[PDB]
């Protein structure tokens, strides 16, 4: 197992706001067997230090939800530990390829297994960006069939109080 | 069978002669409405000197 380099001179004061989920590269059996009836999903990001401050917004069975999180940093710029907030423990988190105007690609790892995510800052995504992300999926040693593509419509933000998790 | 609805694979028993996975939805609506309104006035006067 080996670690990719993060985005050089990344900055959470400039990489910020919304990011609509395009797709996820992962080997995990959940997306293979449960993965049907998937949900519209987006990241939302703000500065607090070297560590990113983050939310995910998502629908669950037609009700909108928010996952608040802090990406506590590893001492390396653009590398984080997900603050180990539950018994699954830490997740290694990285920003790997991006331009803050149009797209972001993230790597996430736990229990020795790599996974990757593609985002665009608005509804559409370029096929050149999607082709570059498939190389990041192949650098995660995954196939394009282990890419799962998420709802290109029906995104949500600003959920009510009882639909934010407060995980931090 | 792959169900084209709820999007999943399933297992069938030799007790079932056929499990099909066709969809049909049949709807019938009837809505019926009435409204009515009236107003009336009468006056009389009878006078002397």
UniProtKB/Swiss-Prot annotation, chain A:
- UniProt-recorded Gene Ontology molecular function terms: retinol binding
Q: What domain of life?
A: Eukaryota
Which Gene Ontology cellular-component terms appear in the entry?
A: blood microparticle; extracellular exosome; extracellular region; membrane attack complex; plasma membrane
Q: Which UniProt keywords apply?
A: Complement alternate pathway, Complement pathway, Cytolysis, Disulfide bond, Immunity, Innate immunity, Membrane, Membrane attack complex, Pyrrolidone carboxylic acid, Retinol-binding, Secreted, Signal, Target cell membrane, Target membrane
Question: What biological-process terms (Gene Ontology) are attached?
Answer: complement activation, alternative pathway; complement activation, classical pathway; killing of cells of another organism; positive regulation of immune response
Q: Where is this protein primarily located? A: secreted
Cellular compartment(s): Secreted; Target cell membrane
How the protein is activated or inhibited is described as: Membrane attack complex (MAC) assembly is inhibited by CD59, thereby protecting self-cells from damage during complement activation. MAC assembly is also inhibited by clusterin (CLU) chaperones that inhibit polymerization of C9.
Q: Does the keyword Disulfide bond apply?
A: yes
Give the disulfide map: 64-156
Subunit composition?
Heterotrimer of 3 chains: alpha (C8A), beta (C8B) and gamma (C8G); the alpha and gamma chains are disulfide bonded. Component of the membrane attack complex (MAC), composed of complement C5b, C6, C7, C8A, C8B, C8G and multiple copies of the pore-forming subunit C9.
State the family it belongs to: Belongs to the calycin superfamily. Lipocalin family.
What exactly does this protein do?
Component of the membrane attack complex (MAC), a multiprotein complex activated by the complement cascade, which inserts into a target cell membrane and forms a pore, leading to target cell membrane rupture and cell lysis. The MAC is initiated by proteolytic cleavage of C5 into complement C5b in response to the classical, alternative, lectin and GZMK complement pathways. The complement pathways consist in a cascade of proteins that leads to phagocytosis and breakdown of pathogens and signaling that strengthens the adaptive immune system.
Q: What is this protein called?
A: Complement component C8 gamma chain
Curated annotation (Swiss-Prot), chain B:
Q: Where in the cell is it found?
A: Secreted; Target cell membrane
Q: Which residues are glycosylated?
A: 35
Q: How is it modified after translation?
A: C-, N- and O-glycosylated. O-glycosylated with core 1 or possibly core 8 glycans.
The protein's assembly and partners: Monomer or dimer; as a C5b-7 complex it can also form multimeric rosettes. Component of the membrane attack complex (MAC), composed of complement C5b, C6, C7, C8A, C8B, C8G and multiple copies of the pore-forming subunit C9.
Per the record, the similarity remark reads: Belongs to the complement C6/C7/C8/C9 family.
Q: What does this protein do?
A: Component of the membrane attack complex (MAC), a multiprotein complex activated by the complement cascade, which inserts into a target cell membrane and forms a pore, leading to target cell membrane rupture and cell lysis. The MAC is initiated by proteolytic cleavage of C5 into complement C5b in response to the classical, alternative, lectin and GZMK complement pathways. The complement pathways consist in a cascade of proteins that leads to phagocytosis and breakdown of pathogens and signaling that strengthens the adaptive immune system. C7 serves as a membrane anchor.
Q: Which disease is it linked to?
A: Complement component 7 deficiency: A rare defect of the complement classical pathway associated with susceptibility to severe recurrent infections, predominantly by Neisseria gonorrhoeae or Neisseria meningitidis.
Protein name from the UniProt record: Complement component C7
Give from-to of the shown chain within the full protein: 168 to 216 of 843
